[PDB]
């Protein structure tokens, strides 16, 4: 069936800059596309149809051009409410949304402030242990958390999530929790969270000894 | 104009659920209707379309013959019956009208899981030297092992908003959810100001106020 690419996967530009985003098809779809903008927790909003026709009430700074295989949605002067994920969509035959592309505001790099929390003694009574690592007020969004227990790489037993770009400082924050049994927790000594980020010349490590 | 979805809820894997979509503000028979779904943190996925008078039906791959999209041009409603749902179908389910999809609904959330309704255990994330950085301390509340979403969290009954980060929840391997909410405060304020996270899990009728004191 018809599948569509969206390039890039994420984009960053400053307020007033020109944002150009591409969408590709697995077919010659001529000019039969729509583009949508969707903000967190909100339904999509239709912006452009037939590749170039703006919808009613959509600012003139939103423009598109199309050519069967290669399509360009362009925000000609990025405004602060243009922070969203943008989705192209084909309808030359059936309908398929692209993967989408997130657009955030570009600010200077900010390294994360790293904080680490041992599991509470209340939780340890429950029979489980969660170790929490917080990465605060960093930019850009891309960061890597790597859990180590007595230097061992933890892989697959942690989960993380990220805030949306803060409305006034434009940074992200991330929280990762390492889940492990109380019995495994009491069996190891050094618990460490090692952060990789563009603002760090070398990975920063936050660690504690059980006790 | 307005589309209002209904249905939604926790249903067991393999069991049934029907979604409804009421449309106010226009003649319903002029437009084709869509159902579009969105998994947590994933992009829009087109489910199906119904032709303006119901003659032409088309579905997406992942439907795999399990869904059925019908239409009631007299009641201005479209439906989508889901007979044998898989956890892979967990998502917000949107309504949209088409000739582009200009009008959408706010969406209704289908939760497909065998987990039983459960209120969270609120554990402190106590501030310590290893949660401190140059006079800024971090503290929080781990809202662990609850089902289903949502859980709301404020601090000191809403009197504390600056420096709060309440992170998106995550679905643990156990099928229960877990989220954290963290605040950054001055270090020197630790021994003076009291920090309480007010947690509310209405599906389980559980409200918890958890004071977070240092170690």
Numbering used by the authors:
A (entry chain L): 1 to 211
B (entry chain H): 2 to 52, 52A, 53 to 82, 82A, 82B, 82C, 83 to 96, 100K, ...
What's the publication's text?
The HCMV Pentamer, composed of gH, gL, UL128, UL130, and UL131A, enhances entry into epithelial, endothelial, and myeloid cells by interacting with the cell surface receptor neuropilin 2 (NRP2). The other critical tropism-determining complex is the HCMV Pentamer, which is composed of glycoproteins UL128, UL130, and UL131A and the same gH and gL proteins that comprise the bulk of the HCMV Trimer. This elongated heteropentamer mediates tropism for endothelial and epithelial cells by binding to neuropilin 2 (NRP2) and triggering the viral fusion protein, gB, to facilitate entry into host cells. HCMV-directed antibodies isolated from asymptomatic donors predominantly target the Pentamer, suggesting that Pentamer-specific antibodies may restrict viral dissemination, making Pentamer a target for the development of vaccines and immunotherapeutics.
Model building was facilitated by high-resolution crystal structures of unbound Fabs (1-103: 1.9 Å, 1-32: 2.1 Å, 2-18: 2.8 Å, and 2-25: 2.5 Å), which were then used as reference restraints and lightly refined as a part of the complex. Three of these antibodies (1-103, 2-18, and 2-25) bound solely to the UL proteins at the head of the Pentamer, whereas the fourth (1-32) bound to gL near the junction between the UL proteins and the conserved gH/gL scaffold. Despite the ability to recognize the gH/gL heterodimer that serves as the scaffold for assembly of both the HCMV Pentamer and Trimer, 1-32 was only capable of neutralizing HCMV infection in epithelial cells. In contrast, Fab 1-32, which binds to the junction between gL and the UL head of Pentamer, occupies the same space as several of the loops of the a1 domain of NRP2 (residues 45 to 48; 72 to 77; 106 to 110) via its CDRL1. Given that higher concentrations of antibody are typically required to inhibit adhered virions compared to free virions, it is expected that 1-103 and 1-32 exhibited substantially weaker neutralization potencies in this post-attachment assay. Because the dimerization interface is formed by two copies of UL128, it is likely that the binding of 2-18 and 2-25 would prevent dimerization from taking place while still allowing NRP2 engagement to occur. It is likely that 1-32 would also interfere with Pentamer dimerization; however, this antibody also competes with NRP2 domain a1, as we show here.
